[PDB]
């Protein structure tokens, strides 16, 4: 009972269909680079301007008012799942995302909630999604998301960010059993959460495995890949059993060049790429079945609008007009110029049509 | 006029020759993971326990007293080159390596010294090298080192570490000319520095391009690769003109999977790999000419000595007995067990002989 979708270019490309042009969207399009974002976010603390459906809906809609993006992604904050599981967050302006009491011992797993009750704890996210879907009025598709089990585990064990994930990786090597237990708890919480996002109106889903690069092939296949596979399988199955139409799913493993081949067979329609992987090589690695979501170096946007058009043109030529969704190689940075984000969007649209005509 | 080398297994493998076993050494073998390292380092501040030849020689020799490593690498601190160029460092216990006044504007380049005078400013490093070469008494070869131009530039512009190198990368996109100027200054300082290390007794050289991964293929080929090539070319030429025998050179580009092919043709005998690149794929990328220095996940050392032996065995089987030097995928971490470092070293020696016998 939602408005009928008008522009579905993003969904068609996601399923691997040919389109009149290449659809484009930016990770963190609703981000600090936009002045209006900081103002709206300054209403209250992080987990308050997030817990308000109208607030999250507004943040989601903001970039679309500036740029003709081909998709919207629900605005939401990282640590919502770990939080819903029972962990306390202390979001400060300096550090950012943080758990004052991280999981360090196996016994620490006992304070976590049964993953089966997480969905009911995240009802505010579902409300924001429905509201955003209603307010979008079918302009473009709405993407729901969550972080992958391993990446969520790194936040829970590290307590925040890290350049090595040494504490989390120590868990993998020293506490393999406890690690698998935690990764399973995280998977059982993500499935109902992601399913709930689709039920609330999400028309696509992206799983962010942001800290994939810290693991090598072996650890990744052992602790990250199995759960990345389980999420897609279980989400699709539950959607079908509920009478709903599965949505296209995207797996993004930042710095996961070494896993591109496994990921193309992990049950996801789209495989997101970071900017370090050359488009053509990525095409080789993934094959010819899956859709590639595509990697401009976010920092490339620091260059002039003219230089951006040329870098975008070259990026499009490498990817080819088939099975491709333009995007950056990572989220937008806080100090980037909104005008340059517009140039990126306009360049993808202009050149993708030329690459066809 | 130095002692004749007894164990040259490391040098022979570096040149691509067959050896009775696989030589092994660890980046940061002289590091905080060793109690004796912290004590010696606690004599004075960072740039004082470094500026003392006997102190640096001692730090270099410490790991060799514990483990039968096949090479020693001179102990030295990152920021020595930028420092010798005229930048002030404020090494604190919490943050670590830091420049309170980073380069931000093009005009900031004027306060730098002529790269031609840097070698004379780094004489203390040369003295420590000669002293260490004398004290080693030809046990194993002595490796000299420096950081690559781009990586040194990131420290100078960022002022320290960063997860994105956004300020440094902004220089590449917004100030391409100034960036090339800085990268050239850094190259003209590194060549005489590295040449000086060989003149002082270094029997091999490793260039660390630690922040390679932040760049994608395009930026890397534009701002990092040219200078990585210039360093090896110029160092070899100057050594020859001086009547000295060139030493084997190693290029290590952490997170530089995308550049393995270019690097194997950059004029270096050895190409170091991080732990995210599968050995076999690295072999494909680099070819059959160059030697590969090999990548165990440093965190793997958190596993039991038994698990370490097995991971080492598998690593050796993938690399193959030819053109290979065992090592970790990155430097050792401060909280690692010295006993586990010994297990790694012993495992490489044991299995490499079995892989041959």
From Swiss-Prot, chains A, B:
The record marks 77 as: Transition state stabilizer. Coproporphyrinogen III binds at residues 28, 30, 32, 77, 155, 210, 330. Its main location: cytoplasm. It catalyses: uroporphyrinogen III + 4 H(+) = coproporphyrinogen III + 4 CO2; uroporphyrinogen I + 4 H(+) = coproporphyrinogen I + 4 CO2. Pathway: Porphyrin-containing compound metabolism; protoporphyrin-IX biosynthesis; coproporphyrinogen-III from 5-aminolevulinate: step 4/4. It is found in: Cytoplasm, Cytosol. Changing residue 211 to P: In HEP; mild form. Changing residue 158 to K: In HEP and FPCT; nearly normal activity. Keywords: Acetylation, Cytoplasm, Decarboxylase, Disease variant, Heme biosynthesis, Lyase, Porphyrin biosynthesis. One of its GO terms (biological process) is heme B biosynthetic process. Coproporphyrinogen I binds at residues 28, 30, 32, 41, 77, 155, 210, 330. Disulfide bonds: none annotated. GO terms for molecular function: uroporphyrinogen decarboxylase activity. The keyword Iron does not apply. Pfam families: URO-D. It comes from the Eukaryota. The keyword Hydrolase does not apply. PANTHER family: METHYLTETRAHYDROFOLATE:HOMOCYSTEINE METHYLTRANSFERASE RELATED (PTHR21091), UROPORPHYRINOGEN DECARBOXYLASE (PTHR21091:SF169). This is Uroporphyrinogen decarboxylase. It comes from Homo sapiens (Human). The lineage of its organism: Eukaryota, Metazoa, Chordata, Craniata, Vertebrata. The gene is UROD.
